[PDB]
Amino acid sequence: ETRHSEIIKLENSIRELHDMFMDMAMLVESQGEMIDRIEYNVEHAVDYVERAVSDTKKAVKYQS
Amino acid sequence: GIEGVKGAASGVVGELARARLALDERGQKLSDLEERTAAMMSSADSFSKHAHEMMLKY
């Protein structure tokens, strides 16, 4: 009964380890969706600022 | 061994728990960053509209 009980103690530890790895993968995937949205906002912000620089440059041309 | 393997598993659980705690912080920081970049984007959008209107007057 002894080796059986110790093997079971080991399985319990390995299940804890496994479940933490599974959780880590899920959380990283979810957070990746947020990073996708941050990156989208940043790309559009960059574009708006580039357009603004270009338009103020043109206004100077059209003075001038 | 069984004790040696159990020890190695415990060891990994501890190291991974530290990484999990750091991943929780990253999530909190990312939620904050999403708000900050959404606000930065809105400002950029408005500035672009006004620069465009300005250009079209001359």
Next chain:
Amino acid sequence: MASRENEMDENLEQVSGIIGNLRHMALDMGNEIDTQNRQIDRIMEKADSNKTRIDEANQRAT
């Protein structure tokens, strides 16, 4: 000696080996998350600074 005791032992050796790999992964995960957390802090400060700078130019233009 026996196929049951033999599979048990082989299973435990394979498990032991894989755990060593799992340990290496947990190290790399911790290192990558720590570096990214520091980078996110920098990005956040830059986001707000940018927003301020945009808002102030936008008032000259409104």
Next chain:
Amino acid sequence: RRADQLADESLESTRRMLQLVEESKDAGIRTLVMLDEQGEQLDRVEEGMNHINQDMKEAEKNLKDLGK
């Protein structure tokens, strides 16, 4: 007898362990691939922040050339 029922339960435990660590290995590898890709996204995001800051210097100069 009871010893056979227990030796069988122990064997099956080691099989479950092997499955658990193999699944853990697959999850760990996918996690590291995601963290790497997400890391390159953050590099692009930071690049964007820096580009905005530099563009704003040019915008400010232009507004000053407009008398604003």
